[PDB]
């Protein structure tokens, strides 16, 4: 929202007051209160006929400092509020001296300068990481529309860059952008987002959560070019500065505070296929495609029924179309017996044509206007109404339908929509419609998650969710939305992907080839490799099945090759997924997140790290030309085994069975002995692979159990020309490959054999020590 | 301006119509006209009750395709219009087939697809570089405010970045930004710009001029994230696609089309010093500060009299304050005797207090409101009015006042202000006030320039100009405005300077340490190095004197060092200045402009190239830490002589006498023998320096005369271990230093002598040959 | 109320939508329900982001066919309602075929045409006595004053004249007149009436009760010159076609009914 009119003027009609001078500081237990005047009040004659700001500084978690800046406290302030985890007993330091008032939590302090020169500074071990300079916060009275706002502008340093604010499809680095945190259904091609989060982080190793579920208007270097401005229509503004000093450290703190990503079941990491949208579904049709996959040796793990499992104009009323699906439970059992898991499409709206609509209207379960009439429109479905998830009895009705599906053998749900939540309404519970707009997505998705958790169990729970809000990362997986079938669109999708992990979400799915019914085969092929080198991977079209043999034999070879690869990568991939759950480290990581000290990484948005150890760079051309950056180190191609040195850009040409997938040096990586399914016993048959172990280094590999705990650890340590290998825990019949090493001087406690990728050592005793040439 | 509401919807109250189907194509001599219906009009029953668009394709210069898209022709469409160089006999090719209509100029063509699938494509040698997809242009009927607009959206590809749009201070790459081309006085810290230009260029080697002097609203990947959208309130839209294929080639065609930078005189490249803003000037005071410079051996070339040469509240009336300035010409001629050029402050407004105000009001020389009263406000000066430069007698009055000052010894002018031009007015010539807002900057400066052309002569003409519009690059030098004194402000300024170069401006000046009275010394010193390694360089304060001895002795050393350096660099610098005049290649280049095929350079904004061969990275920290990227090659520090290998980032620490200033490999550089003034005979006493000449390369060095023409060329070519040096033209008593070469095998036709930087070779006969060891 | 602006245009700021294609028919005991889309929804790609009309056909009394056309059911719809005598047990026939959906009470049927060429026809023993042509009913969204209306236009044949609409003092035959059914104290010499009734009959031996106690706005051949248009500020419209085949017989059924 524009406040200034250049450096020198203010927007017409706006009156601003700022905290300009500390009047008084009070310590109130473990909180520091600062009273700040909008003018010089050092003399008693000015100590009246003036506003005063009340600033409270508190810490909900270690290394998080909350700042609340209030004008009037008599305002109503209804919920909902974000599902923050707030501790009451965090150890803090408060020092109130003649020159400063300073509140400290962990290494992060907020310091306010007393006297004539006001300043609010955020420090890390006493070094300023950002702050608010005088006249850059306060209260805005808009005499044009009689609304009042609070605002802040937090400084950016030279070269400081901003990331996050939800899953967004604009340029990855946010400087120069205005962003409004307001869920919308705008596709994947605009400034709009389905999943808005009023959290940003920077390449200086801190983050900020602006604690308002309503729309927050961010001007990120777009009003004042070297500040992040945010404003909200409220009598107070509350934000939280979150220390790092690294991006992963910020997200660990942010996810402890707002919710940890759940760990999804291993089966969910396989290939999903759907009915497509406006095609025709029935059991025979579904089985021709399922058998088609199997005939071509294309592994398939999850099958999804889309909207037309229900009758047109009646969505979402949970009634199976009886023409198309005369025996829904029998059909799903027959698919399950093949080893498939089952998903169905849901959303939180209902068309008036549904016979159940009248029941809901009579029971009061639908969202109402203030006059008590139903809120209705004709977008999506005719006479559409919204389920009022603030009405406990409505929640129960909805949950019971979901339970009926699960009871029939449905394993998971696509929690679609949830964005276009009106404000000219009265919620059952009387909450603030401005805040409910975004928080609806959380309540909806929580409701569905809990059905799974109470039925199949939490270990088995998973969604494909289109909308989100703060805290909803606890209910994975989040799905990137509707895309066009072209390379520009594939690129903007990956920006959305990186962004959502920069906003606290550990897992991200998307649809290979997008949604547009005719993709060129080359786009579909490139996008398959990206899709299967992502945490979660789906094939889903519009007017026809997204099956590879729609294109060519080669597209089938591509789907098979990368599906096999991901399955074999699972002992690695699932350990990296447990990190998302433990520390909020997303699986798909922006280069800046993994290599925060490398200035070549600040703007890299066409490549990513998949877990700690592998760089992937999708190919965005038919011809196969791709340029990418490698950070310092000698990297090795995951299956070509060619090496590249880092701290520079590289240019290559890849065919459709290839793309840059480079493994860091000093890495020990576990591949499994199953290329047909993701869910199998990873610690038996394990093939370990050691890449560029330098002298003085140690590489650790943790193989997880089904629940993501570490069941076996292998370590390879080099001193001189001797590498010492030690394993701890449970594993059977494993092997260690010395990538690109053709010959060894000697080996204690194992046998050896040549391979194309290098010597394969088999252990017996554990020295497993190997001696290099 | 927002047009869509996400992918799926339109903003409330907007009615859109698009060209969707070719109805008829007509060649009109050297122009192609397309008639395009917004619906299917194949049947005659639909060939009525429909709008029709008229698209005209034409070529003003080789390699530029103009695209005029029209709704109603009956609109008034008054001027002004931009000062475009339009040829009528450009060789073009027009092809009209069953499938396509295609208009071609040089390698660039516009092709429109017939039949069902409308497309508008810009092709370079038949390969699409950008385009407009169906429904991404057309007419917007805004039913909320009864305004009508035309719009276009030109596609961006994967990793395609956007640059330019005037001198702006937001992030350098424009993707994610809205920009409005509307001159404002907003400082140097916001999204506002004094110098707006509706031209952008990309890292794909083309550019586009939107040919509208009104406000043009650009959504640069900010509405549709992979398109540049532009709209204007008009019944037609006209734009020009300008081919490269290289950034420099685009700016060449752009500056031929809209105007070439003039070649400023060599004295102008010296050190400018000002009175400062609110100092109490008087002959003695002024001379004491000029004497202080000379006493400390700080070379000084231009002195500027700021606002207070005139009486308070009477700016700009051209009357010397008689109490302060009893003898203006006597004073200025005394100052000139000391070897100085003289600049004075001017602007295009006048305060009511001035005696001259009533003269002008009575003559009708001031801008009027439609009722005949004067337009006035109290911003800047009390009851400030504006000189109506559409009134030819008003222009004559003002030019005569300028001629009076030049007759007194004034050499040049600071053309300040020009931005805040109201639209609630009636111009003498009846122009469109909406177009005059920006174009005023042009007329104002053009008039002042011509006074100079007509007095001191074209070769001697130079300005410091604060505002600009298209064409005004003809009237150098453009001055970057009012800056706060901190490192962030410093970095903002550099983005603005780099941006102006990417908008057709060949020269850019700025003030060392900014404007604000108390910068720390460390900032002043850092900024000093940056200022003197720019085309144009000035010292100017607010309340404070901007003399370095205010700070410390070291501030004097820094000033001296970098002023000596710039003067020694003039043989190099002035040749690069002529490139700006001949081709529109700016002196200060964004890295992407010089190294367009290096993907490391896309977002680089804290460093630049200063001409062809030297990279400067200012230091934006007190401690002296700086990180910079070097392109491929072995680079050499210009005076430290240390070498660095490229294609990578580097981290260094520099004291106040240093920064990264690296010379490219295979370079022959001319240094001059005067460190006291920029204007001397560069071709006598020249010190050539040869940097890392590789086997099978040649380095050329062109030494210019005072008019920018080449007076001497030196070439060094290496094959094996023989380097052959060849001189052509007029030079005297020059030398060749073999940098980092201490010892050589032999020399034919030359003598050698040691030096700390390398072997210095003096010619005799010019069959000069060096054989390496 | 003015809806059209001559044959070719619509009043500025009114957005219209019409039932133009049968999507589905459903028989619900002795009632027939036709779901009708405002555009072509034969293909699943188009079976979303569209309004849909719900028409219900029912018979309160033999020889009376009730027709309720509905946009949104979410509206409050408080009373009072007219004191109608409504039977639940009237003998009717419902015939749903590839060509038509037809609902018959006595000699009177309502028939809707399926496929490309929507039509709503009222037949007496299979001959058409009136009906509604495509785009002559539907929903009016008035963007000028933020109110919404439902409307219908029932055809008049050559020489067909209209009567009733209460105790009115204008020309007896209603053709050419607009009439607002809103009680007023305006004397006996004006367009106003003390005694308003939204019921008309014609010299073709049928009548029609528009079943709304609020103001009902009739354009009785006064907008479309050969149709009786009627509109009401409501999310639904409900009217009853009443067979004769003589004026006295209509009146017999009308007074049994009301
Ligand atoms: O059946 N058609 O091909 C048809 C198409 C468009 C139409 O548009 C309307 O034509 C109307 C009548 S056509 C007019 O011009 C052509 C002659 O053949 C007719 O006799 C004359 O009345 C115009 O008055 C309206 O303003 C215009 O909207 C009419 C008919
Ligand atoms: O391909 N079609 O036949 C099609 C039809 C209507 C469409 O309309 C849009 O559907 C959009 C997305 S589709 C959605 O539901 C069906 C699933 O198959 C998708 O995966 C899911 O995102 C909605 O979000 C928009 O609000 C709506 O206007 C889109 C596509």
UniProtKB/Swiss-Prot annotation, chain C:
Homohexamer. Can catalyze the transfer of alpha-xylosyl residue from alpha-xyloside to xylose, glucose, mannose, fructose, maltose, isomaltose, nigerose, kojibiose, sucrose and trehalose. Belongs to the glycosyl hydrolase 31 family. Transmembrane segments: none annotated. The gene is yicI. This is Alpha-xylosidase.
């Amino acid at each position: 929202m524009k406040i200034s009119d250049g450096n020198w003027l203010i927007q017409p009609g706006l009156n601003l007051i700022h905290p300009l001078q500390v009047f008084e500081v009070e310590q109130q237990d473990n909180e520091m209160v600062v009273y700040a005047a909008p003018r010089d009040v050092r003399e008693r004659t000015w100590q009246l006929d003036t506003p005063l700001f009340t600033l409270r500084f508190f810490s909900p978690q270690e290394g998080i400092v909350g700042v609340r800046i209030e004008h009037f406290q008599g305002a109503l302030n209804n919920g909902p509020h974000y599902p923050l985890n707030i501790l009451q007993d965090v150890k803090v330091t408060i020092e109130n001296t003649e020159r400063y008032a300073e509140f400290k939590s962990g290494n992060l302090s907020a310091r306010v300068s007393k006297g004539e020169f006001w300043s609010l500074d955020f420090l890390r071990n006493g070094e300023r990481i950002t702050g608010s300079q005088v006249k850059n916060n306060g209260y805005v009275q808009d005499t044009n529309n009689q609304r009042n706002y609070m605002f802040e502008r937090l400084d950016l340093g030279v070269g400081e860059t901003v990331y996050g604010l939800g899953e967004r499809f604009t340029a990855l680095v946010r400087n120069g952008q205005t962003v409004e945190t307001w869920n919308r259904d705008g596709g994947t091609s605009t400034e709009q987002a389905y999943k808005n989060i009023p959290f940003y982080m920077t390449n200086r190793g801190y983050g900020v959560l602006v604690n308002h579920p309503q729309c927050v208007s961010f001007e990120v270097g777009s009003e004042k070019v070297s500040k992040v401005q945010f404003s909200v229509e409220s009598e107070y503004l509350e934000y939280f500065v979150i220390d790092g000093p690294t991006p992963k450290a910020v997200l660990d703190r942010y996810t402890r505070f707002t919710g940890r990503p759940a760990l999804p079941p291993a089966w969910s990491f396989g290939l999903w296929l759907t009915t497509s949208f406006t095609t025709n579904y029935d059991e025979a049709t579904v089985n021709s495609f399922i058998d088609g996959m199997a005939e071509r040796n294309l592994p398939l793990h999850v099958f999804h029924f889309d909207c037309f499992w229900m009758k047109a104009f009646q969505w979402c009323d949970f009634e199976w179309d009886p023409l198309t699906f005369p025996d829904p439970e029998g059909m799903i059992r027959r698919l399950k017996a093949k080893g498939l898991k089952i998903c169905v499409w849901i959303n939180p709206y209902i068309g008036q044509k549904s016979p159940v609509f009248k029941e809901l209207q009579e029971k009061g379960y639908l969202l109402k206007r203030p006059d008590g009439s139903l809120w209705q429109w004709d977008k999506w479905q005719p006479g559409l109404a919204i389920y009022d998830f603030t009405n406990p009895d409505a929640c129960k009705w909805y949950a019971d339908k979901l339970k009926g599906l699960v009871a029939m053998g449905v394993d998971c749900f696509k929690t679609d929509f949830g964005e276009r939540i009106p404000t000219d309404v009265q919620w059952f519970d009387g909450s603030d419609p401005q805040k409910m707009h975004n928080h609806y997505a959380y309540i909806y998705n929580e409701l569905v998650w809990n059905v799974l958790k109470d039925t199949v169990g939490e270990e088995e729970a998973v969604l494909f969710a289109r909308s989100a809000s703060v805290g909803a990362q606890k209910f994975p997986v989040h799905w990137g939305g509707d895309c066009y079938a072209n390379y520009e669109s594939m690129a903007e999708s990956l920006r959305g992907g990186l962004s959502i992990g920069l906003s606290g979400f550990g897992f991200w799915s998307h649809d290979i080839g997008g949604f547009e019914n005719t993709a060129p085969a080359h786009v579909y092929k490139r996008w398959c490799a990206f899709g299967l080198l992502s945490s979660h991977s789906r094939l889903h079209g519009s007017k026809s099945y997204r099956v590879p043999w729609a294109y060519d034999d080669e597209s089938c070879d591509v789907v098979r090759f990368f599906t096999q690869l991901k399955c074999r990568m699972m002992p690695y991939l699932y350990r990296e997924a447990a990190r998302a759950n433990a520390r909020g480290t997303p699986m798909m990581r922006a280069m800046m997140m993994e290599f925060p000290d490398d200035p070549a990484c600040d703007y890299l948005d066409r490549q990513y790290m998949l877990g700690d150890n592998v760089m992937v760079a999708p190919v965005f051309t038919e011809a196969g030309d791709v340029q990418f950056y490698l950070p310092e180190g000698r990297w090795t191609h995951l299956w070509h085994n060619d090496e590249l040195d880092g701290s520079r850009w590289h240019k290559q040409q890849h065919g459709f069975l290839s793309l840059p997938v480079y493994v860091r040096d000093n890495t020990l990586l576990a591949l499994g002995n199953n290329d047909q399914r993701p869910d199998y016993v990873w610690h038996e048959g394990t093939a370990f692979h050691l890449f560029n172990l330098q002298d003085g280094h140690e590489a650790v590999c943790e193989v997880p159990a089904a629940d993501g705990s570490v069941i076996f650890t292998l370590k390879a340590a080099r001193t001189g020309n001797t590498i010492t290998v030690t394993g701890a825990g449970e594993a059977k019949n494993w092997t260690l490959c010395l990538r690109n090493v053709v010959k060894v001087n000697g080996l204690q406690d194992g046998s050896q054999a040549e391979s194309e990728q290098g010597l394969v050592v088999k252990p017996q005793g554990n020295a497993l020590t190997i001696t290099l040439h």
